[PDB]
Amino acid sequence: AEHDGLTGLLNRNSLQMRLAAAIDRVEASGESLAVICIDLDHFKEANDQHGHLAGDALLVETARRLQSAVQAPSFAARLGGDEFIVVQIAGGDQPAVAAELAGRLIEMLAAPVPFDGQELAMGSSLGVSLYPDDGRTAEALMANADMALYRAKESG
Structure with missing residues (x-):
């Protein structure tokens, strides 16, 4: 019910x-909250x-x-297909702290994966939405991060 069967996210x-x-946590605490939408190239x-x-x-x-x-307190999900989401709860400078994790995610997803005695090409693209400027509800942030993913795939 709460996990993706295929992956356990x-x-x-x-x-x-x-x-x-x-959102309720960070509105009270002052922590930063970012939503990162990721897909595989x-x-x-x-x-x-x-x-x-x-696949x-x-x-x-x-x-x-x-x-x-x-x-x-951060967490990861798979929506379906090759669409993943990471929610980052963190401190400090929000645009920087989210950009820093984004960079680490791209790096970690770059290496190929062994399969059936071959290697399969990995590589990812991602979009980032920040609370509250990019949305004040879960659905608003979801949607905005998906739009950001589209923009990132068009522009690189």
């Missing part, structure tokens, strides 16, 4: 619940060239990498 349901709660080609189990291997390894990097 949060699912859409639990993401939305935890993001809504995080070569998921379609893995599925096309090596079948559905190859799955990409998803499983992405999740493993995200579980290594994202610790409470």
Whole structure:
């Protein structure tokens, strides 16, 4: 019910619940809150060239990498397909602190993944939304981060 079966990350349901709660937390605490939408550059080609189990291997390894990097109170979810979300709760300069994690995420998702005695191309794109300027509700931040992902994929 609260986890993505394939990867063990949060699912859409639990993401939305935890993001809504995080907004209330940070409104009171003064912590920074950012939503990062991530997708994989070569998921379609893995599925096309090596079948559905190859794309799955990409998803499983992405999740493993995200579980290594994202610790409470931050959290990670897979929505569906190759679309992932990371919610960062942190301190300090909000645009900087989110940009710093974003950079680390891109780096960690760059390395290929072994599959069936071959290596599959990884690489990711991401978009960032910051509370409250990019939205004051979970849904507003979700949507804005997805738009930011679109913009990032168009511009690089």
